[PDB]
Each structure stands twice: as C-alpha cells, then as structure tokens.
Amino acid sequence: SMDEECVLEAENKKLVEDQEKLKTELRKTSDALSKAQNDVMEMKMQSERLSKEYDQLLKEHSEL
Amino acid sequence: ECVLEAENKKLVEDQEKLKTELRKTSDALSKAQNDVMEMKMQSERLSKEYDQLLKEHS
Amino acid sequence: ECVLEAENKKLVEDQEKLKTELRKTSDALSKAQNDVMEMKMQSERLSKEYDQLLKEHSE
Amino acid sequence: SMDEECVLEAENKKLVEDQEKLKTELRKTSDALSKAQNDVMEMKMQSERLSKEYDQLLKEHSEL
C-alpha cells in the first residue's frame, strides 16, 4: 500500500543520482581538458621543429 | 635545388601536422565547453530538487 | 529546527559558490578557445607567407 | 636589385617575427588551459563538499 514514505524515498534517490551524474560530468570535463593539454604540448614541440626547419632553410638558401 | 625540394616537402607536411593538431585541440576544448553546459544544468537541477525537498517537508 | 537552519544556510552558500565556479570555468575555457583560434589564424598567415616566399624567389 | 635585397630582408624578418608570435601564443594558451584545469579541480572539490553536506543533511533529518 503506497504512502508518503514511498514518495520521499523516490525524491531522495533522485537527489543522490543527480549528485552522481554531476560527478561523472566533472570527470568527462577533466578528461577532455587533459586531451587538450596533450594536444597543446604536441603543438609546442611540432612548432619548435618547424621553427628550426625555417631557420635552416633561410640559412642554407640566401635567395630565400 | 634538390635539397631545397626535399626540405620543402618535409616542411609542408609538418605544417599539415600542426594544422591537424590545432583542429584536435579546438575540438577537445569544444567538448569541454559542452560538458560545462551540462554541469550548469545538472547543478541547477540539484539545487531545485533540494529546494523542493525543503518546501515540501520543512 | 535551528541546526537545520544553519546547515541550510551553509548548503545554499556552497551551491552559489559552485555556480560562480561554473561561470568562471566557462569564461576560462572561452579564453583558451579564442587563444587556439588565434593560433590557427597565425599559423595560416605563416604558411601563406612561406608559400609566397618560395613562389617569388624559387622554382 | 637593391630593392630585391630590401623586399627579401623585410619578408625574412616577417617570417621570423610570425614564428615568434606563434611561440608566444602557444605559451599563453598553455597558461589559460592550465587555469581552466585547476578551475575544474576546484569544482570537483567543491561538489564533493556539497555531497558531504547533502548526505549529512538527509542522514540527520529523516523527514527530508
């Protein structure tokens, strides 16, 4: 026989479940930002090699 | 001219690598922003739930 | 009823604090994103003028 | 052909300068990203605090 206790339990359960979801979303967010961090580092190194290649190219070929 | 040609090929393909890397970075940040929208809505849900709990039972 | 009032005040302040942190975070991300798009434009200007350099002074 | 040395000089300076600008932008970008990552860590800590308070609240007050 359903009573108000029944509904109370449902509401509390919902509060807890949404806390869990916010936790999950936080983790997905940090994961994405860590991917971005790695990508930025990749760009840093790639850019340093590229800059060395530019330097080298202009040094060997004075007409450029 | 030979060495210049090879060097140029290398330089261009590395530029392409940088371009790809840029796109990937942008995409990652976009994913993070979407996630933050989600968290704003989720936390609004949490505080509304709490408020409702209080209004009903206190 | 008293302890409930105190705990509630505390809880509310922490919710608003979290809200502010979320806004702060989206702002920070928008800053980063703008920075990345700026690097995209810059790298395009760089490769473009490199192309012009080789087109003008090479075969 | 003095003009030639001119244009070539200007163009080289511009290539170098734009390399430098990309370098600077990469450094600042990494800074901004690090800022956002720490902001997310702060929200994790804050939301765990909120979770502890919700738990305590529902535990002490059965009518909630």
From Swiss-Prot, chain C:
User: Family per UniProt?
Assistant: Belongs to the BCAP29/BCAP31 family.
Keywords attached to this Swiss-Prot or TrEMBL record, sorted alphabetically, are:
Apoptosis, Coiled coil, Endoplasmic reticulum, ER-Golgi transport, Membrane, Protein transport, Transmembrane, Transmembrane helix, Transport
Q: Which GO terms describe its biological process?
A: apoptotic process; endoplasmic reticulum to Golgi vesicle-mediated transport; intracellular protein transport; osteoblast differentiation; protein localization to endoplasmic reticulum exit site
Subcellular location per UniProt equals:
Endoplasmic reticulum membrane
Record's Gene Ontology CC terms?
endoplasmic reticulum membrane; membrane
According to its UniProt entry, what is the function of this protein? May play a role in anterograde transport of membrane proteins from the endoplasmic reticulum to the Golgi. May be involved in CASP8-mediated apoptosis.
Q: Does the keyword Cell division apply?
A: no
Q: What is said about its interaction partners and assembly?
A: Homodimer. Heterodimer with BCAP31. Binds CASP8 (isoform 9) as a complex containing BCAP31, BCAP29, BCL2 and/or BCL2L1. Interacts with VAMP3, VAMP1 and membrane IgD immunoglobulins. May interact with ACTG1 and non-muscle myosin II.
Q: Which residues of the full protein are shown?
A: 170 to 228 of 241
- What protein am I looking at? B-cell receptor-associated protein 29
Q: Which residue stretches belong to region Disordered?
A: 29-54
Which segments of the protein form a coiled coil according to its record? 1-59
- Positions with biased composition (Basic and acidic residues): 37-54
